[PDB]
């Protein structure tokens, strides 16, 4: 297939942090970025597959992006403006994905901006103190305005005269100002009782609409400054869209993210598959093929498309609300990719959706915190173990509707590893940051869970305190278990009773990740290859085929590696052997890259730099050999191709 991006959620409680220009380009603000989605025929997808593609990220802001508006002037649809809590308002070109200009005029946290419908280079920004700036970027000018000492929530330039701008406030007040008259208040619009969420001008000449947290929409005659009709709706963000096609109809959000189309001529109509939590923005987009769509962003972290002719949802783009901590592919369901997210939901992604590139199912029940580990049962379908940062281990029947089973036992600290292995029918092993590895019974998960350090102590000859275990990986045949430790040690234990056969002292810091090379290779000696990463940059590979066959009486110490992979410049969070190759490793690092290695020749192959933060996990696509999935603390998962990469090594 082609690349995909599982992007961060659109930001919440912003009057305008997303917009769309006609033809088919949609942009929404998410974390520190603006993500770009070409929507329509020009997105290039099979008739049946939803016509959208995430194509671009606008990279450059330092803190939360508070506002985003496109330039809607014909032949200039490629410009757009952003505001950010870093005090910046940047002008962007979407073809280059770069900044054209900016201004740090605002001395207080910006609330919103808006690109004038009439003046080709005028962007009007307002902050939480009530200060409004006007910025003409092609003429290099900047008019300062102060209207009143109140918290600006929204701001909409008039489509019908260059000088009028409506401003809504946290306390319900709405006013219309004139820039050419130095911010004079022309119309005070008295009526609202609470937070103004949106202001939409009538598209034909003038009237004016406002949605407020006081559960009413209001239309105003901006001539006689009076309110000529009030609409009460049947937790709330109340955003509006006045369609140019139906100048007599009006779209609004409603409780629970429900969307309405009212009739100006007490009457409403329902959309639809609907949103489940409050909706923040609504963006009209007319495709090349003349379809009238409307894009909606929502607290439920879905980005939905609506066909205004049918008022049904054409597709949904889901998003991630926290770090992508974990990626697990199922061996029973081949395309099934489990994602552990910091926002407390597991994502299972059918990466083989015949007619849907983002077929993702969320799992709310049971989980109530950062999912930091995941593992599929090797044989049972739908069987998915997860661990959290509250130390909770859990099991999940992902075909079922029903809330998961929780282990009666919690780890003291975060759950970083989960592996299935034989009991010491199949047992769940969970490792916590405190250093305990526990053995769970899936049959009776509420019962006793045995800390395996007691058997390690019984079956070996111990007179010291055991290490703090930080990572567990079983070998492919289910006969050798490796534990990584805080000191950097890795310990090799043999099948029935965790007999220790070997200790590797190669790392000098905490081990984060161990992976054994797969058995499906084209040669035996490879399944005994172990890859490991620690809080240091250098990755090691070790060849344990001697000591496992040697089956020693006493445990042996190893101080020399089989292969050394230097390149990364920060800790290694995850490593994975390619299932389609022999000795090909991918590694995720805190240096924000992922490196593909041919581990046998100590050769760097390619380096993925598409992430915007520290990487936490990597998983090879189980069917495409040049395709890999990544997860980082940028609230993203990228599905990228080895062959599309520009660099072979990690930076420095």
Stretch that binds ligand MGT, among 193-201, 394-402, 409-417, 540-548 (CB under 6 A): 409-417
DSSP state of 23: B
Q: Is 635 in the site for ligand MGT (CB under 6 A)?
A: no
Provide the minimum distance between the beta carbon of 475 and ligand MGT in the complex, in angstroms, as a whole number.
17
Site mask for ligand MGT (CB under 6 A), range 568-607, x = bound: -----x----------------------------------
Provide the minimum distance between the beta carbon of 435 and ligand MGT in the complex, in angstroms, as a whole number.
8
The values of phi and psi at residue 524, to 5°, are: -70, -50
Stretch that binds ligand MGT, among 146-154, 278-286, 290-298, 410-418 (CB under 6 A): 410-418
Nearer residue to ligand MGT within complex by CB, 84 or 512: 512
Stretch that binds ligand MGT, among 116-124, 263-271, 330-338, 411-419 (CB under 6 A): 411-419
Provide the minimum distance between the beta carbon of 564 and ligand MGT in the complex, in angstroms, as a whole number.
21
The values of phi and psi at residue 384, to 5°, are: -135, 110
Radius of gyration of the chain (CA): 28
Identify the three-state secondary structure at position 643: helix
Q: Where would I find the beta strands (DSSP E) of 517-602? A: 529-534, 539-543, 556-558, 563-565, 572-577, 584-589, 594-598
Nearer residue to ligand MGT within complex by CB, 252 or 417: 417
Provide the minimum distance between the beta carbon of 493 and ligand MGT in the complex, in angstroms, as a whole number.
17
Length in residues, the chain: 652
Nearer residue to ligand MGT within complex by CB, 112 or 470: 470
Q: Is 281 in the site for ligand MGT (CB under 6 A)?
A: no
- Binder among 52, 325, 386, 420 for ligand MGT (CB under 6 A): 325
Nearer residue to ligand MGT within complex by CB, 563 or 571: 571
Query: How many amino acids of this chain bind ligand MGT (CB under 6 A)?
Result: 11
DSSP for 336-358, please give it: EEEEEETTS-EEEEETT-TT-TT
Provide the minimum distance between the beta carbon of 575 and ligand MGT in the complex, in angstroms, as a whole number.
10
- Binder among 470, 473, 485, 642 for ligand MGT (CB under 6 A): 470
Q: How far apart are CA 118 and CA 107, in angstroms?
A: 27
**Coarse DSSP helix, strand, coil percentages of the chain, rounded to the nearest 5 percent:** 5, 50, 45
DSSP for 198-232, please give it: EEEE-S---EEEEEETTSEEEEEETTTTEEEEEEE
Q: Is 386 in the site for ligand MGT (CB under 6 A)?
A: no
Nearer residue to ligand MGT within complex by CB, 296 or 535: 535
What is the CB neighbour count within 10 angstroms for residue 197?
27
- Binder among 253, 417, 473, 506 for ligand MGT (CB under 6 A): 417
Closest CA to 375 of 414, 323, 321, 325: 325
Pull the structure tokens for residue 234.
């049947």
Show contacts with ligand MGT in window 512-531 (CB under 6 A). 512
The residues near 131 (Cβ < 8 Å, ≥ 6 apart) are 106, 107, 108, 144, 145, 146
Cα separations in angstroms, 266 against 207, 231, 236, 249, 250:
18, 7, 20, 12, 12
Provide the minimum distance between the beta carbon of 502 and ligand MGT in the complex, in angstroms, as a whole number.
20
Nearest residue to ligand MGT on Cβ basis:
416
Q: Is 433 in the site for ligand MGT (CB under 6 A)?
A: yes
Q: Is 629 in the site for ligand MGT (CB under 6 A)?
A: no
- Binder among 262, 416, 528, 640 for ligand MGT (CB under 6 A): 416
Closest CA to 220 of 250, 194, 178, 261: 250
Nearer residue to ligand MGT within complex by CB, 407 or 414: 414
Q: Is 210 in the site for ligand MGT (CB under 6 A)?
A: no
The residues near 299 (Cβ < 8 Å, ≥ 6 apart) are 12, 237, 257, 277, 278, 279, 280
Provide the minimum distance between the beta carbon of 484 and ligand MGT in the complex, in angstroms, as a whole number.
7
Q: Is 429 in the site for ligand MGT (CB under 6 A)?
A: no
465 sits in the region (left: phi over 0; alpha: psi -120 to 50; else beta) called beta
Nearer residue to ligand MGT within complex by CB, 470 or 536: 470
Pull the structure tokens for residue 642.
């080895």
Pull the structure tokens for residue 57.
């990220």
Provide the minimum distance between the beta carbon of 512 and ligand MGT in the complex, in angstroms, as a whole number.
4
Stretch that binds ligand MGT, among 53-61, 136-144, 356-364, 413-421 (CB under 6 A): 413-421
Provide the minimum distance between the beta carbon of 119 and ligand MGT in the complex, in angstroms, as a whole number.
47
The values of phi and psi at residue 601, to 5°, are: -95, 5
Provide the minimum distance between the beta carbon of 18 and ligand MGT in the complex, in angstroms, as a whole number.
30
Query: Which residues make up the interface to ligand MGT (CB under 6 A)?
Result: 325, 414, 416-417, 433, 470-471, 510, 512, 573, 616
């Amino acid at each position: 297939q082609e690349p995909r991006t599982l992007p961060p959620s659109p930001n919440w409680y912003c009057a305008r942090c997303s917009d769309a220009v006609p033809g088919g380009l949609f942009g929404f603000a998410a974390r520190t970025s603006v993500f770009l989605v070409r929507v329509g025929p020009g997105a290039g997808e099979s008739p049946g597959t939803p016509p959208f593609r995430v194509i671009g990220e606008l990279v450059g802001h330092t803190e939360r992006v508070s506002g985003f508006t496109f330039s809607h002037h014909p032949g200039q649809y490629n410009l757009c403006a952003t505001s950010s809590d870093d005090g910046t308002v940047k002008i962007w070109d979407v073809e280059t994905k770069t900044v054209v200009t900016e201004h740090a005029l605002h001395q207080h946290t910006i609330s919103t901006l808006h690109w004038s419908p009439r003046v080709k280079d005028l962007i009007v920004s307002g902050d939480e103190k009530g200060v409004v700036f006007c910025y003409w970027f092609n003429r290099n000018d900047s008019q300062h305005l102060f209207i009143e000492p109140r918290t600006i929530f929204c701001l909409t330039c008039s489509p019908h005269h260059e000088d009028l701008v409506a401003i809504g406030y946290k306390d319900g007040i709405v006013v219309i100002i004139d820039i050419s008259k130095k911010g004079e208040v022309i119309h005070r619009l008295r009526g609202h009782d609470d937070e103004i969420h949106s202001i939409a001008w009538c598209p034909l000449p003038c009237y004016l609409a406002t949605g407020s947290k006081d559960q009413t929409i209001r239309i105003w005659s901006c001539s006689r400054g009076r309110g000529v009709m009030i609409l009460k709706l049947p937790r709330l963000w109340l955003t509006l869209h006045w369609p140019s096609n139906q100048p007599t109809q009006l779209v609004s959000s409603c409780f629970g993210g429900e969307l309405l189309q009212w009739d100006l001529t007490r009457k409403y109509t329902l959309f639809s598959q609907n949103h489940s939590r409050i909706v923040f923005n609504l963006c009209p987009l007319q495709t090349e093929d003349d379809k009238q769509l409307l894009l909606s962003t929502s607290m439920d972290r879905d980005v939905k498309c609506w066909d205004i002719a049918t008022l049904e949802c054409s597709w949904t783009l889901p998003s991630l609300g926290g770090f992508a901590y974990s990626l697990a592919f199922s061996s029973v369901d081949i395309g099934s990719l489990a994602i552990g997210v910091g926002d407390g939901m597991i994502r299972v992604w059918n990466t083989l959706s015949i007619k849907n590139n983002y077929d993702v199912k969320n799992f709310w029940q049971g989980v109530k915190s950062k999912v930091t580990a995941l593992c599929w049962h090797p044989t049972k379908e739908g069987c998915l173990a997860f661990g959290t940062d509250d130390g909770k281990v859990g099991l999940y029947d992902t075909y079922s509707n029903k809330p998961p089973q929780i282990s009666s036992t919690y780890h003291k600290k975060t759950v970083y590893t989960l592996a299935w292995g034989p009991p010491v029918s199949l047992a769940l092993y969970s490792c916590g940051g405190e250093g305990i590895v526990l053995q769970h019974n899936p049959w009776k998960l509420s019962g006793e869970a045995f800390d395996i350090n007691k058997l390690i102590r019984d079956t070996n000859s111990i007179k010291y305190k055991l290490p703090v275990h930080t990572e567990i990986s079983w070998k492919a045949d289910g006969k050798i278990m490796a534990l990584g430790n805080e000191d950097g040690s890795i310990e090799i234990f043999q099948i029935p009773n965790l007999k220790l056969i070997c200790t590797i002292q190669q790392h000098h810091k905490l081990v984060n990740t161990i992976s054994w090379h797969h058995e499906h290779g084209s040669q035996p000696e490879l399944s005994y290859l172990m890859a490991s990463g620690s809080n240091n940059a250098v990755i090691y590979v070790h060849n344990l085929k001697t000591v496992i066959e040697s089956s020693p009486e006493s445990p042996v110490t190893i101080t020399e590696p089989y292969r050394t992979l230097s390149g990364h410049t920060a800790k290694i969070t995850s490593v994975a052997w390619s299932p389609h190759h022999d000795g090909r490793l991918v590694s995720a690092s805190y240096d924000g890259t992922a490196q593909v290695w041919d581990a046998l020749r100590e050769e760097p192959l390619c380096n993925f730099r598409g992430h915007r933060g520290r990487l936490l996990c990597v998983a090879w696509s189980p069917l495409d050999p040049d395709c890999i999935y990544s997860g980082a603390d940028d609230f993203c998962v990228h599905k990228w191709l080895t062959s599309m990469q520009d660099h072979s090594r990690p930076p420095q």
